[PDB]
Write a protein that binds this ligand. Structure first.
Ligand SMILES: [Zn+2]
Ligand SMILES: [Zn+2]
Ligand SMILES: [Zn+2]
Lengths: 254, 44, 49, 65, 48
RNA sequence: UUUUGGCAUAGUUGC
């Protein structure tokens, strides 16, 4: 009537992704962790844009929407930030937001690429990830783009720009020993990269007592967070959600 | 009000009484200048 | 894999890229409702304003 | 119009790869080789660069105002 | 009602304005109805 | 201090 004793084995760790394996766990917990990776890890992304002057071929909403998807290095600064609506400031402050300013005037006879390099933050710890660089817009001669922006804490459930992951590969039972999926012709199906079957075999023998365990993860970071940090913040956030629900339930019972 | 000529980009002032025409090209298409009221977008 | 439970789906889904087109008929141009509005001048019945 | 910042499906950054992609095509890469050189494995990401049309270049021919 | 005597038009009814409304335009340009035009023709001919 | 509006021809399009 109690918790499992889950175990971790990291099979690969780079700056782009972490690949690991969780054993001795329910499928629901593993899927919830996989889901929290996408929807509930808070990062910093541009969410307030004031355009002082735009002469580009792209209208203002296009530029703002593109700026929102710029990923920002939010490794440690995100934890000490607060959500803006929770912050008591007069709408903005260094404790709930990070200011950006962009001012690019193409006064030359060559197409000026306005990239992420031109985004200038008021905080050195929160820069564009590429700072090759993400192209915001291209400008002709005599075209100015001048705006300020603010980037705030949020998570991917609200909007996909706060999604830190760039694809979360998730798997379990690579040889289909549980027959949670039924191949009409198992011969035709290529082996998973985690399969332990020899090539003369196409499918592990059926396991009547099996249960899903040994879930294989490959979490790729878009760049806002290191993948280690993505997984750790995900587990911390899910634990925080469960503890808050525990507090509310204790209040409701009392 | 300031209008921008549609052929030679010259910002020129025009009253609400005179016919519109570029004062250094003679062109007959003018565009209003962008508003100076603050415009704010969420980046969503 | 089922997005909610994370379980494998029993059947194997046909999936791949395909060219799709967003037709001009958005809902926001087709939604309307009438209640006590501008009737006709001759027929005293509701009219398309 | 212009290259999207993110792949629509997986959300991988693909906006900083258009210029490099074109550069690799000027290096006489096959388009598969160029996409591999840029580290785009999932065909969701490969679809982005492989099917993008950079119409903004055509739009910068017209005069500014 | 409906004596045959009354089938021949001796006096013609004039509909009210609610049947032939004069729609106002572009300020005070009163556009008349086709019925009003036919009645204008009929009253001119009957005056003659 | 609380407004109101062209119509009736043709075309195109949706189920
Ligand atoms: Zn604040
Ligand atoms: Zn002119
Ligand atoms: Zn992708």
């Amino acid at each position: 009537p109690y918790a499992n004793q889950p175990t971790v084995r990291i099979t690969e760790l780079t700056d782009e992704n972490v690949k690991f394996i969780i054993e001795n766990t329910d499928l629901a917990v593993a899927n919830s962790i996989r889901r929290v990776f996408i929807a509930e890890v808070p990062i910093i992304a541009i969410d307030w844009v004031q355009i002082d002057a735009n002469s580009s071929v792209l209208h203002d909403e296009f530029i703002a929407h593109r700026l929102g998807l710029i990923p920002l290095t939010s490794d440690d600064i995100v934890d000490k930030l607060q959500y803006s609506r929770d912050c008591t400031c007069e709408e903005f402050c260094p404790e709930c937001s990070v200011e950006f300013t962009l001012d690019v005037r193409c006064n030359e006879d060559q197409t000026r690429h306005v990239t992420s390099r031109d985004l200038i933050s008021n905080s050195p710890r929160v820069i564009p990830v590429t700072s090759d660089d993400i192209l915001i817009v291209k400008l002709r001669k005599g075209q100015e783009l001048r705006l300020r922006a603010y980037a705030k804490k949020g998570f991917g459930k609200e909007h996909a720009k706060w999604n830190p992951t760039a694809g979360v590969a998730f798997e379990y039972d690579p040889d289909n020993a549980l027959r949670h999926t039924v191949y009409p012709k198992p011969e035709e199906w290529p082996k998973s990269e985690y399969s332990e079957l020899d090539e003369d075999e196409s499918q592990a023998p059926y396991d009547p007592n099996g249960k899903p365990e040994r879930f294989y993860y490959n979490v790729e970071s878009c760049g806002s967070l290191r993948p280690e940090t993505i997984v750790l913040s995900a587990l911390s956030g899910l634990k925080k959600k469960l503890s808050d629900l525990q507090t509310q339930l204790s209040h409701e019972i009392q | 009000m300031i209008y921008i000529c549609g052929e030679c980009h010259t910002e020129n002032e025009i009253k609400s009484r005179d016919p519109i025409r570029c004062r250094e090209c003679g062109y007959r298409i003018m565009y209003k200048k962008r508003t100076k009221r603050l415009v704010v977008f969420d980046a969503r | 894999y089922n997005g909610f439970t994370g379980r494998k789906i029993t059947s194997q889904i046909f999936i791949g890229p395909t060219y799709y087109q967003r037709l001009k008929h958005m809902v926001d141009d087709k939604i309307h409702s009438r209640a006590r509005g501008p009737i006709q001048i001759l027929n005293r019945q509701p009219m398309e304003g | 119009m212009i290259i999207p910042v993110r792949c629509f499906t997986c959300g991988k950054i693909v906006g900083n790869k258009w210029e490099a992609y074109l550069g690799l095509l000027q290096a006489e890469y096959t388009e598969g080789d160029a996409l591999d050189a840029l580290g785009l494995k999932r065909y969701c990401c490969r679809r982005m660069l492989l099917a993008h049309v950079d119409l903004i270049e055509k739009l910068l021919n017209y005069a500014p105002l | 009602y409906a004596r045959p005597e009354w089938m021949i038009v001796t006096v013609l009814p004039v509909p009210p304005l609610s049947v032939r409304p004069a729609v106002v335009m572009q300020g005070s340009a009163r556009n008349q109805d086709d019925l009003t035009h036919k009645l204008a023709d009929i009253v001119k001919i009957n005056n003659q």
